[PDB]
A paper describes a structure:
Lectins are carbohydrate binding proteins unrelated to immunoglobulins that display no enzymatic activity towards the recognized sugars. Lectins purified from seeds of the Diocleinae subtribe exhibit a high degree of sequence identity notwithstanding that they show very distinct biological activities. In the present study, we used mass spectrometry to determine the amino acid sequence of a lectin from [name] seeds and solved its crystal structure in complex with Xman and the dimannosides Man(α1-3)Man(α1-O)Me and Man(α1-4)Man(α1-O)Me. Furthermore, we characterized the anti-inflammatory properties of Cbol, adding more data to the repertoire of wide biological activities displayed by this group of lectins, despite their highly identical sequence.
Other than in the carbohydrate-binding region, the complexes do not present any significant structural differences when compared to the unbound protein.
Author numbering:
A (entry chain B), B (entry chain B), C (entry chain A), D (entry chain A): 1 to 237
Write the structure that this text describes.
């Protein structure tokens, strides 16, 4: 079983799994049932931006999603990740469609992570930035229906030639290099991630959403994790 | 009256002002009376490192001080700085000595601040790093007894030719450029700061401490702010 | 007399001062007479981007200007800046108009500079980024006709209410903090700068151009340095 | 056959392969026979620092090696890498010993690479920094005799339990993620790399040296490339 920590933009309220009554941001720790959520007003066909922040001092995971018109939603959860994740992890983006559907299109993604040790600095750090994705992007590991290069963007879930989103689709993109997320001997571990995205739906009720996630290095898409499970978890426990 | 927000390494417990019974880290908002403190075991003559982190999402100010031997102390306080500081500020370091004394020596200082707007990025950012200070460091504004260039370090308070710390001393160093700390239209404002320091005392009970601070751009040392007031505040209110 | 090193985007050929027979990029060292130039096809009304790069190892100053359509021009010149500039400098943008005119609009500007010493690192560095300029941008020093905040941009030369460029105009913007550009004891000093710009003209030939420059810290606009002198030099020597 | 571009710190002059009559820095393009070299006074047992810089504008590859005592050597070579390397590459460190020997210890290594496209920015970038290496450093690919974790350092070539260097040894470390080094449509591609190293020898002349290199993504150590071939090239052509 993979170990997953994620921030979800959940466009589809499955109330059966503890989802709220409306599209939402949520913080998911080893469960599809968010530890915390906040109401999110999703704008169809508009380009949004998500920022994720964490530091080992405050031990608080925070996320915000905003649109150029000023609408934004934030969620924060107090958690000590030293106690959750493995020392080494990979980070990525995941997206799905269900019975209902949407394009899950990533326009850009950047990430920064830092470890300052008991050695008093001698800091290790990683930063990457993608503002365009080519057809062969060798520094990304693509899983599922994810493709790169279409209009210089990353399409996480299946889209036809004419731009129409497909249902029952799942895809993920992980950064090629492993990340050293924490160390018992680290005095501070902190990271932030940013991505811009475009969700569009022709039909009623888009679903199911997009998530930024951190997993064990060897993580792969759990079976039947399409739709409401967001390509992250094998079940709703 | 200046507006001050600071993180204090308070080596001297003035219990009269609400200081704890022991040297401590503290978070000070417009008052010398910390909103929150944590016990700190100060190691005389050892080089320490302080990290300060804040983000507008979690709205939590965090600080940690550590030594190479693994000892560290952390403190966090939930605060919305949009409601405290002016839109534009300056950042700096301050240090003092009282009746008792210590060297306040800064070995290195770095800082990073970012504003992502309602414009959806078009981000503004500032970063600077000093790992050595020359005799004339033009990008620093020195106030009080602060000097640069001695052994490539920044000495915040008065030290004689032979290295002996002087009492009743106060000094500050501010970065030359103003910083845009928040904007009503900003979706995220975040910053972090790091500095390494060396506190040494020949006599009993070093005092009074060192602080990292953010103030209105025109801030200058309040009169009689030496000793326990840390060159920050005009009084103990 | 100021000491000026600049990269010019010269939209107007003043053959009398050694300018080429067409708009051009040029490298100017202590003279309006470029040490090296390259032909530049300026696109009226289009948004361009300039990048400038230098390092103390190769001791080569390089610049490129490009447009989204793929047109670009580059120029490089071998030079040891240790022998030209003062140890401490300021960096800025300058623009002018003359008998002929153009808007000199800066959309964004970023800069990074680093000094790695004989101390083996203990590196000092500065980075800033502006992707929007507000009406009161405290970390910029504005000289001449330069204004900030109009459509979130920086307008270096005078523009009327209705958007019409004015003739015989000059303006500069300098970053507020001084920059430590070289040190006798530095093993490497390197910097890069980037800005995006929009030049528009209603009338016949636009003039006179925009430059990125580095000067002594107290540099101010030389008298009569409008038009072909680009606000940088007091004469054409 | 791999495609290799490297900067060599050649501690052993093999005059038979065009090496100079003294230890030297060199720039090697697809050949062990440096295109350019500079005399290098290697200090046995001292910690050195190497910096490497390149940009697509100046199209000049530069390198400097320095020690804390102020001794340094630099070498530069004009080259258009667009015409040499594949679009995607990996970067790494290599070292060898031969008949003669030395420790090839890396203390720290950082790297930054950036591509600004014809799209006008939408920049892609990668940065990493190692200031300590643990026993299991998952973001490094180790080849040959290379090991990590001994005193928090990276030992590229074989060293016994007691610290004694072994002869006829070769080892390399490559960053785990591929790097997009150029693109036909990029307006600027630039990178820099820095590492600190410790070379020690008990016996008479140390050999054979350490190199920073860029290769095709699937590059592996060519057979018999120990000693003077530095683990990079299959022959001396
Ligand atoms: Ca769902
Ligand atoms: Ca006190
Ligand atoms: Ca001109
Ligand atoms: Ca050799
Ligand atoms: Mn949910
Ligand atoms: Mn206190
Ligand atoms: Mn000219
Ligand atoms: Mn050689």
């Amino acid at each position: 079983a993979d170990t997953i920590v994620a921030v979800e933009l959940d466009t589809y309220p499955n109330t059966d799994i503890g989802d709220p009554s409306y599209p939402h941001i949520g913080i998911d720790i080893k469960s599809v049932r968010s530890k915390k959520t906040a109401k999110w007003n999703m704008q169809n066909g508009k380009v949004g931006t998500a920022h994720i922040i964490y530091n080992s001092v405050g031990k608080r995971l925070s996320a915000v999603v905003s649109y150029p018109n000023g609408d934004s939603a934030t969620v924060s959860y107090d958690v000590d990740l030293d106690n959750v994740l493995p020392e080494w992890v990979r980070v990525g983006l995941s997206a799905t469609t269900g019975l209902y559907k949407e394009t899950n299109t990533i326009l850009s993604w950047s990430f920064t992570s830092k470890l300052k040790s008991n050695s008093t600095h001698e800091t290790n750090a990683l930063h990457f930035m993608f503002n365009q994705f080519s057809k062969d992007q060798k520094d990304l590991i693509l899983q599922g229906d994810a493709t790169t290069g279409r209009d210089g963007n990353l399409e996480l879930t299946r889209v036809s030639s004419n731009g129409s989103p497909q249902g029952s689709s799942v895809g993920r993109a992980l950064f090629y290099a492993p990340v050293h997320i924490w160390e018992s001997s680290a005095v501070v571990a902190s990271f932030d991630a940013t991505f811009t995205f475009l969700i569009k739906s022709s039909d009623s009720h888009p679903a199911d959403g997009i998530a930024f996630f951190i997993s064990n290095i060897d993580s792969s898409i759990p079976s039947g994790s399409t739709g409401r499970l967001l390509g992250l978890f094998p079940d709703a426990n």
